[PDB]
Amino acid sequence: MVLSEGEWQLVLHVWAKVEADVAGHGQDILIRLFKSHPEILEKFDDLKHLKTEAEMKASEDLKKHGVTVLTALGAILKKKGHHEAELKPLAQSHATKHKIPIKYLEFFSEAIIHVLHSRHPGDFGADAQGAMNKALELFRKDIAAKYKELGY
Ligand code: HEM
């Protein structure tokens, strides 16, 4: 699958709203993800004790993890599908060290999309919704293949 330049433009236009407050979006996305999927919280040894929303918002460690994922994903999206080099070390760490099943990445994509609908609807209309679905599907397809390429 291959996105048009117009689709990438819609993706990166709403992504620019995320990067206006990366830490705040990271908190929102991760808190949504951890509440929807408590099994994912269990994968973070430094976070897995967290329970309340106030506790999650107070955690400097959670905030750092939100910045790390959104910064890496932003760099990948700006490759507009030419992301082989970026996906290799991510597959290695997430498959073999963090032990993240591939389906968890779909739950992360769902949390991104939920936060974009809530925060930035004026930049997330019908066309941009479709384009973001496609960009995250392409990311998931390609990283799932990288998981397999490493034997996981
Ligand atoms: C449900 C989805 C995911 C889970 C559960 C997960 C889990 C983790 C964990 C446990 C760590 C190690 C944290 C630490 O102890 O310092 C980590 C690191 C990291 N994650 Fe994720 N991750 C997910 C998705 C992603 C995605 C989609 C990206 C980028 C597009 C990403 C980028 C990173 C980066 C850059 C690091 C630091 C370096 C590395 O270990 O590769 N993560 N992740």
Swiss-Prot record:
CC per GO annotation: extracellular exosome; sarcoplasm
Binding site for heme b: 94
Keywords assigned: Cytoplasm, Heme, Iron, Metal-binding, Muscle protein, Oxidoreductase, Oxygen transport, Phosphoprotein, Transport
Domain Globin, chain residue ranges per copy: 2-148
Catalytic activities: Fe(III)-heme b-[protein] + nitric oxide + H2O = Fe(II)-heme b-[protein] + nitrite + 2 H(+); H2O2 + AH2 = A + 2 H2O
Modified residues (Phosphoserine): 4
PANTHER family for the chain: MYOGLOBIN (PTHR47132:SF1)
Entry protein name: Myoglobin
Gene name tied to this protein: MB
